[PDB]
């Protein structure tokens, strides 16, 4: 067990964690717990606090903060220790003490907007960071060399129990022809994984008189950075344009394949990727799993496979009246929580 440690910039305070990524079970977010070792010789600020800060960066508007009295042991605070922290203290000695956080549920997951290729600024998107600083009072200026920072991630893994197969069916009639055009799409399972093939079973019954010119399958990523404002934005992450055509009065059935993966999703900045520590490569933002059903402040992620039917135009209305038909199905793009 490699414990990511970090001494203070001037080698006076050392923060030791147990890990760097935290699993968001929706019902409970695992705790950010660690230990702090202080050197008395260089320790004279007379008090220290360790603060866990969840910030959305775009202008670094914070979304959450929580502080723990790192030293001296707060007389009012008395809570049981964790295995990691107690074992690390036993390893180090009596001049170190623990700090245990408890993230409140219903907070943004560790989602990072994809960094730009030709850019060097700090990554956007929410992120959690533990900052340890010696100070008599919180108002005291926190000198950079007398304070340390260490990033972490709260993230979600794919749902375990598979859900129902998302089958979307639709109909489209027209003034010229009363016969309905029936369309259907499905997906092999209810939850997909990053870089896994997606099967779109596009079936059609085009009894109409117009002509089908093309068919489009997409894996549009709906990312909603829902602040107090309720936004929702679109970004396609995979597309197949099948030239399969159903001329007037034709019945159709074909299965198409689409695997959203980051290989071709680099030039497009801002795509919701997972949480990054410094710059390591990461995958498309795992689908957010909102409880039940408040719109949690922060980023939320979803994916819909949008089957389409490029239908020809013409007739009494000519090309003025668009005859586009589509049908969308929500699925889940998360990571297979390993054993």
């Amino acid at each position: 067990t490699r414990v990511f440690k970090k001494a203070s910039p001037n080698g006076k305070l050392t923060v030791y964690l147990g890990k760097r990524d935290f699993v968001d079970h929706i019902d409970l977010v695992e705790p950010v717990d660690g230990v702090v070792l202080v050197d008395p010789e260089y320790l004279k600020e007379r008090r220290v606090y360790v603060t866990l800060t969840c910030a959305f960066r775009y202008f670094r508007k914070d979304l959450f903060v929580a502080n723990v009295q790192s030293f001296p042991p707060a007389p009012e605070d008395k809570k049981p220790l964790t295995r990691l922290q107690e074992r690390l203290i036993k390893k180090l000695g009596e001049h170190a003490y623990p700090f245990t956080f408890e993230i409140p549920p219903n907070l943004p997951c560790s989602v990072t907007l994809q960094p730009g290729p030709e850019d060097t600024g700090k990554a956007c998107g929410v992120d959690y960071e533990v900052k340890a600083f010696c100070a008599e009072n919180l108002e005291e200026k926190i000198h950079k060399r007398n304070s340390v920072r260490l990033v972490i991630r709260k993230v979600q893994y794919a749902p375990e129990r598979p859900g129902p197969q998302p089958t979307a069916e639709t109909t489209r009639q027209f003034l010229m022809s009363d016969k309905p055009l029936h369309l259907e799409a499905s997906l092999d399972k209810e939850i997909y994984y990053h870089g896994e093939p997606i099967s779109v079973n596009v079936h059609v019954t085009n009894n109409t008189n117009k002509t089908v010119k093309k068919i489009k399958i997409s894996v549009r990523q709906y990312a909603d950075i829902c602040l107090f404002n309720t936004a929702q934005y679109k970004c396609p992450v995979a597309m197949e344009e099948a030239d399969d055509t159903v001329a007037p009065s034709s019945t159709f059935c074909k299965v198409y394949t689409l695997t959203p993966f980051l290989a071709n999703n680099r030039e497009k900045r801002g795509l919701a990727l997972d949480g990054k520590l410094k710059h390591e490569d990461t995958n498309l933002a795992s689908s957010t799993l909102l409880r039940e059903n408040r719109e949690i402040l922060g980023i939320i992620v979803s994916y819909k496979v949008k089957v389409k039917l490029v239908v020809s135009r013409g007739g009494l209305l000519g090309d003025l009246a668009s005859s586009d038909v589509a049908v969308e199905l929500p699925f889940t793009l998360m990571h297979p929580k390993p054993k």
Partner: antibody
Framework: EVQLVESGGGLVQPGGSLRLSCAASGFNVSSSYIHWVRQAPGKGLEWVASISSYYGYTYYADSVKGRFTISADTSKNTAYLQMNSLRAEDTAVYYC??????????????????????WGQGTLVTVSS | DIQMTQSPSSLSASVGDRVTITCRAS??????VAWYQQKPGKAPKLLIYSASSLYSGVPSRFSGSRSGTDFTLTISSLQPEDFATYYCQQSYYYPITFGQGTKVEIKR
């Protein structure tokens, strides 16, 4: 279970080309590194190539830095090591191996390229006029 | 490019003999060395990884140890099946590189 099936090897004169196909089953080519390693007659191993499909990255050995064009298809879930201008030294019993990019922790340890756990049978490839 | 100074080129050992194969990475490796066993004709069966991790299903006799940049693979109780080449392989950097192989013949 994970299984790599290697195919596309046989006699080819010097200056010719083959195309090894490593069909991947039990795992997705996207979520792993696919390596090719050639062992010549009476010699040791010699790493040839490696690819990560999800991030679309490729690494090549010095001996094949341009003559081999590894790629992959996720639809068929297969890797394709082209082998152009196979020279005499290339005579070897090629093998397809891979590294599951799944970190024991969260999703992917994208910076390991670690030990190639699963090795395909590996087929003979000859170069002789 | 990097080179592994695997040695000895070839050693003869008997049943139960304690075999030791050194592998001196020419650079600073970070416990990302892997060891195989390529029986003739067959394919390299991965044994050790990260210079300290025994791959699943491999016999426990194989033991990889790191001494900075000197990775040593030890076979404490040699057994008949372990008469084949062995190639230490660093995975820390690119391109991956193997040792020189070290055949384990029989002694008489």
């Amino acid at each position: 279970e994970v299984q790599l099936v290697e195919s596309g090897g046989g006699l080819v004169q010097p200056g010719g080309s083959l195309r090894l196909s490593c069909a991947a089953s039990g795992f997705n080519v996207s979520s792993s590194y696919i390596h090719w390693v050639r062992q010549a007659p009476g010699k040791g191993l010699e790493w040839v190539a490696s690819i990560s499909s999800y991030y679309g990255y490729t690494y090549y050995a010095d001996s094949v830095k341009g003559r081999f064009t590894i790629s992959a298809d996720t639809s068929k879930n297969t890797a394709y090591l082209q082998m152009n201008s196979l020279r005499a030294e290339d005579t070897a019993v090629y093998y397809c191996a891979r590294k599951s990019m799944y970190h024991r922790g969260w999703g992917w340890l994208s910076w390991v390229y670690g030990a190639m756990d699963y090795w395909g049978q590996g087929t003979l490839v000859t170069v002789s006029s | 490019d990097i080179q592994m100074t695997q040695s000895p080129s070839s050693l003869s050992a008997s049943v139960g003999d304690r075999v030791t194969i050194t592998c001196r990475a020419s650079q600073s490796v970070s416990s990302a060395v892997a060891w195989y066993q390529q029986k003739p004709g067959k394919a390299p069966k991965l044994l050790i990884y990260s210079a300290s991790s025994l791959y699943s299903g491999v016999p426990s006799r194989f033991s990889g140890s790191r001494s900075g940049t000197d990775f040593t693979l030890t076979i404490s109780s040699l057994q008949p099946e372990d008469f084949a080449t062995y190639y230490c392989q660093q995975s820390y950097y690119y391109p991956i590189t193997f040792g020189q192989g070290t055949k384990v013949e029989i002694k008489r």
